[PDB]
Assembly symmetry: C2
Homo-oligomer: 120 residues x 2
């Protein structure tokens, strides 16, 4: 119910079609905190353990040791979903300010809000 931006929860993103990221996996809350408190829905970015290195400017690496993670992981700002809050299950961790500034950069690049080819 009462999530905060920067929180990481488990969520089932299934069912999916084609190259949509499915499965029960960590997701990062990226919605504003007004909707996070008051809305039945939340906007999340999928997290994967299939890669550990950011290949693209829409990727942000998570160090497993520093956070709640079993494996070094990558937040995929190209894989964003508005999900009903019923999909969220247990909380895993909360990302710090420096991590979220990286997230904001990748998220703005993903959504064409700032330049893709610029180093910011």
């Amino acid at each position: 119910m009462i999530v905060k931006r920067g929180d990481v929860y488990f969520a089932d993103l299934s069912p999916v079609v084609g190259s949509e990221q499915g499965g029960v996996r960590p997701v990062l809350v990226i919605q504003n905190d007004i909707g996070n408190r008051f809305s039945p829905t939340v906007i999340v970015a999928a997290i994967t353990a299939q890669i550990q290195k950011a290949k693209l400017p829409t990727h942000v690496e998570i160090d497993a040791k520093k956070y709640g993670f079993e494996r070094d992981s990558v937040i995929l700002l190209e894989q964003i979903r508005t999900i009903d809050k019923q999909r969220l299950t247990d909380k895993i961790t909360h990302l710090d300010e420096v991590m979220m500034i990286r997230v904001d950069e990748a998220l703005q690049i993903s959504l064409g809000l700032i330049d893709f080819l610029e180093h910011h």
Copy 2:
């Protein structure tokens, strides 16, 4: 490329969970144009004709007459989704720069990059 940021397509969003927007409905391409060229996925915002007027800062009105819609509609920047391109069916229209400026502001608000409302 396939689609361009600002393109509006029908997309088959079914099935969904809870308060997620579903069905076959118009959606607005909001992913950057580099991703739109190369990626199998596209990021979109759901459009609804259940509401005609924007009374929340995450909402942008679409005038049907101007844009070749059947019914005046609202773009819901709190309802955004990465979908496989296979979900896109027919192109409806392309929103102009004035509309896309309003979208970008609604997206910044939705995603907590600027204040949700003006703070006294």
